[PDB]
Amino acid sequence: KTFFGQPLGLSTLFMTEMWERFSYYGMRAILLYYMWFLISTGDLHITRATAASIMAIYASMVYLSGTIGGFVADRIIGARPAVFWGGVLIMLGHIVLALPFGASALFGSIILIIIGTGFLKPNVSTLVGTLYDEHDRRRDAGFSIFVFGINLGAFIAPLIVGAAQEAAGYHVAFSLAAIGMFIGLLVYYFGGKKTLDPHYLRPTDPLAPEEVKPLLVKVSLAVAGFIAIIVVMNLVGWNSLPAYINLLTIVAIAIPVFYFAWYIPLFIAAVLFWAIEEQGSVVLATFAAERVDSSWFPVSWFQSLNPLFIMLYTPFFAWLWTAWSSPTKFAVGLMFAGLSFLLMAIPGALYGTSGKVSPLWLVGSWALVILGEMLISPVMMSMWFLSSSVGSALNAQLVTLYNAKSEVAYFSYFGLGSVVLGIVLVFLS
Ligand SMILES: CCCCCCC/C=C\CCCCCC(=O)OC[C@@H](O)CO
Ligand SMILES: CCCCCCC/C=C\CCCCCC(=O)OC[C@@H](O)CO
Ligand SMILES: CCCCCCC/C=C\CCCCCC(=O)OC[C@@H](O)CO
Ligand SMILES: CCCCCCC/C=C\CCCCCC(=O)OC[C@@H](O)CO
Ligand SMILES: CCCCCCC/C=C\CCCCCC(=O)OC[C@H](O)CO
Ligand SMILES: CCCCCCC/C=C\CCCCCC(=O)OC[C@H](O)CO
Ligand SMILES: N[C@@H](Cc1ccccc1)C(=O)O
């Protein structure tokens, strides 16, 4: 009695992440459109460029938060309660958007989700490994099934939430995301008791008595330093929303710069790929709503194409690895990400940017970037959240450059630059 050949505990962790990814991507599939709506009603006083910049820096902070989440669970609270309380905060984040608020609830929702995802995301993957004794062949297979559940929830979420939004408005749609996380917590709590090791109800590497004080000093200096900057920024007048976004961008990018100051192309190639891939929920989401002949279905459903192609490619790629150079899998994967943007430059160049084009352009675009991602994933998970975070931090600046007038050039330059650097890697490798 197994779960696809794996310990039964995988089933609990499978579903738990599926429903968290459901709540997360269901929210993101309509959040940008929700901000557009708040702007159009005059409730939210920002530009569409800023709203899209917020989408990118949001994702950046979510993964940056995931970089330290493992530490807090391993040393302080425990992996199991970290997942639970992380899920609680996430559920609360979606509840906030379900309340009859407008722009006033956005910041609170963002913070709750960032902190919550930071506790849950790295620790649920940690718990997956705990199912396996140290040297097991099943381990690789078990994680792969786990990734499938992640993309499963990411697939059905834009379909369900997006349709719900179209029918019953935004607040109801955000509530379904909250319900999704609630389902995950239910399964996780009761399913976890049956299987999961009681060992991870407590931290596995608890702080030694002499470790507490220097840790306290470290976090206090950082918070004080971060507070000092914000204070200084306000005195000089750099206190607009884009000014804060810039600060977060600088912070997110400074961290790896310093980490290395204390693999470089491999990390850069990862950052650039994730930047392109993460723009599917921002730039491609904008393009879908403005340039696509899609009047017979919710435009938010385009967000399902990314996890759809992942689920479609994985059985094929499972062959390739058994059918027959780690840096080269980054070199080519980045070229495919660049080709996906080059493809998007075509309909605007051929038909102009004023009208509407086929949805098949987006399908082809995602088909290429996911093809790139298939090479990326097989090639320190805290660093995995880091390259992802910087890529999104880069997006927070680049994404603002995108509009109907600049569409063709935007896709062309970043499409070409990505391919070139993929070839630059070919020469270096
Ligand atoms: C919210 C929906 C789930 C039902 C929970 C009911 C109990 C209320 C509060 C319990 C909080 C304690 C946290 C439990 C925990 O660390 O999670 C471990 C899980 O694997 C099983 O214990
Ligand atoms: C290890 C991490 C430490 C690195 C932190 C470095 C931060 C130093 C300075 C950041 C403040 C500048 C960002 C704010 C800003 O310029 O806003 C833009 C403003 O011109 C918009 O009108
Ligand atoms: C690997 C080869 C696959 C085929 C791809 C070749 C096509 C790539 C780019 C061609 C774009 C043509 C679209 C029309 C165009 O650019 O004309 C614009 C300009 O002449 C009019 O103002
Ligand atoms: C691994 C798969 C690679 C994907 C290749 C990229 C696909 C190339 C072109 C896709 C869309 C072509 C247009 C189809 C169409 O029906 O045109 C209608 C018209 O409205 C065009 O805008
Ligand atoms: C590298 C990221 C650090 C961020 C963590 C945020 C938490 C800040 C302070 C929490 C530390 C307090 C925990 C101390 C503790 O419970 O252990 C002391 C006992 O001697 C051991 O059980
Ligand atoms: C085999 C995979 C897909 C192949 C993708 C190849 C596409 C490469 C470039 C496409 C777009 C070329 C640029 C067009 C351009 O800048 O013209 C300007 C427009 O006339 C208006 O700005
Ligand atoms: N699509 C990925 C996003 C991600 C990238 C990198 C690290 C962590 C998460 C997921 O849901 O898991």
Backbone angles phi, psi at 3, to 5 degrees: -110, 95
Count CB neighbours of 404 within 10 A. 14
Q: Is 244 annotated as a binding residue?
A: no
Q: Domain range for residue 224?
A: 1-429
Count: domains in the chain: 1
Helix (H, G, I), strand (E, B) or coil at 378: coil
| CA end-to-end span of the chain | 46
**For residue 144, what are the contacts with CB-CB under 8 A and spacing of at least 6?**
314, 318
CA–CA separation, 15 vs 250, rounded Å?
Answer: 36
How far apart are the CA of 341 and the centre of ligand 3, in A? 13
Q: Is 388 annotated as a binding residue?
A: yes
Any idea what the CATH number is for the domain that residue 354 is in? 1.20.1250.20
Which stretches within 324-357 are classed as H helix?
328-351
**For residue 186, what are the contacts with CB-CB under 8 A and spacing of at least 6?**
none
Resolution in A: 2.5
DSSP label of 75: I
- Which ligand is closest to the CA of 222, given by its number? 2
Nearest CA to ligand 1 atom 4: 186
Cα–Cα distance list, 327 to 83, 263, 425 (Å):
33, 9, 8
Q: Is 213 annotated as a binding residue?
A: no
How far apart are the CA of 279 and the centre of ligand 6, in A? 19
Buried b (16+ CB within 10 A) or exposed e, 259-282: eeeeeeebbbbbbbbbbbbbbbbb
Method: X-ray
How far apart are the CA of 428 and the centre of ligand 6, in A? 27
Backbone angles phi, psi at 405, to 5 degrees: -70, -35
Query: How is 88-150 classified by DSSP, letter by letter?
Result: HHHHHHHHHHHSS--GGGHHHHHHHHHHHHHHHHHHHHHHHHHTS-SS-THHHHHHHHHHHHH
Q: Is 411 left (phi over 0), alpha (psi -120 to 50) or beta?
A: alpha
